[PDB]
């Protein structure tokens, strides 16, 4: 029974080196993806000051997108926005709203089905395999104009620093389905702007909210992918602590068995010698 406790120190010592490799694998991936997050934060805000920010609208049809990770050593990141999904998918539920639940990331389809499966329609995955691009985030967005909701709900984790990741609900309204209806104040707040398009205001806003959808989608799965690497970094430093505290209790247990087996094999030698002498 002194080799079973020695082969466990074989296990915990390499786990404590696997999980310290993944701590700095996810730490170098946190900083070379930070040079893409703050660049992508630029294009988000001219749409949030042109179209405002209207999360609490009573739309007829909605598409909620909880964008999660693909790999799952994140440490409760893909579950924290899953509870924040239904916290958002019950506040805006006010009159019997049609909802399409979409998951970006392979860890979303395994957790949104547990919470809300009948209004779930789409599952995008394998998106962080090479990198996240705007042309990829346009095709993911263009599959959400196949359904025609009045609003879009994007649930993601805003990468603030390596420690804090507050969840975000970014709302995109369909062009004149509900968006100009919410700008209408004693006239309109959209009538200040001179339209310089080929065609009308009704179909330049059709061009402009798909562009507002594709920008916020590209930022969401880029802020989340950098919030993924910084939660795996805090998860793989809590499991090297746990594989060094387990390794410490297992070396104390091994040294006790090492001492007890030298005493046991010695008493077996003296007893066999005292029986002859």
């Amino acid at each position: 029974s002194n080799q079973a406790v020695k082969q466990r120190i074989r296990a915990i010592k390499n786990i404590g080196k696997i999980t310290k490799a993944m701590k700095m694998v996810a730490a170098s991936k946190m900083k070379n993806a930070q040079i893409a997050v703050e660049q992508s934060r630029g294009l988000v805000d001219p749409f949030v000051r042109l179209f405002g920010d209207f999360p609490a609208v009573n739309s007829n049809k909605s598409v909620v997108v909880a964008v999660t990770s693909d790999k799952g050593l994140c440490g409760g990141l893909n579950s924290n926005i899953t509870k924040y999904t239904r916290a958002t998918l019950a506040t805006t539920e006010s009159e019997g709203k049609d909802v399409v639940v979409v998951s970006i990331g392979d860890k979303g389809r395994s957790q949104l089905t547990r919470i809300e499966s009948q209004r779930y329609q789409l599952a995008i995955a394998d998106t962080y395999k090479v990198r996240v691009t705007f042309g990829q985030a346009s095709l993911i967005v263009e599959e959400l104009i196949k359904h025609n909701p009045q609003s879009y709900q994007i649930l993601f984790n805003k990468f603030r620093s390596a420690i804090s990741f507050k969840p975000t609900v970014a709302t995109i309204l369909s062009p004149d389905l509900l968006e100009k209806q919410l700008e209408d104040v004693t006239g309109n707040s959209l009538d200040a702007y001179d339209i310089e398009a080929s065609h009308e205001r009704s179909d330049v806003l059709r061009d402009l909210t798909e562009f507002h959808l594709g920008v916020t989608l590209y930022n969401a799965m880029l802020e989340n992918n950098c919030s993924e690497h910084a939660s795996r970094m805090s998860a793989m430093e809590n499991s090297t602590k746990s594989a060094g505290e387990m390794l410490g209790k297992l070396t104390l247990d091994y040294n006790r068995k090492r001492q007890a087996t030298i005493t046991t094999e010695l008493i077996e030698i003296i007893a066999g010698a005292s029986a002859l002498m």
Binding site: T263, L266, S274
Partner: protein
Amino acid sequence: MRYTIMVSATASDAAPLQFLAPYSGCAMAEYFRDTGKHGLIIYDDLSKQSVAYRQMSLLLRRPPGREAFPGDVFYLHSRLLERAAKLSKELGGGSLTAFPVIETQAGDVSAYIATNVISITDGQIFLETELFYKGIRPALN
């Protein structure tokens, strides 16, 4: 010192003098138990008294035990600590309060002499070495 007796069997002394020193001191503290007064006895490192008794038993060529202890090392401490009693009213009402001290190696309380005195005494005062390093003193677990 006006109320204290100091029985001392140091590390240079013979192992039968260290084995006997808690019984010598218990007999002096039993004077106050048996006359209606109240005693307090501290056996500092009763784990060192079992090591001194392990030495005398191995040199008497008695067979080793679980941790090379004589096997009667429970009776070494049980017959000692049973003398710390609260006597009845017809015996005077005197008392003797024992505080045995056991040194533990790396927090392991599942050792032989540690688990013996736990199954003799009425309670424990566990002193954690991690609460002691944080400055929480007395480091009462």
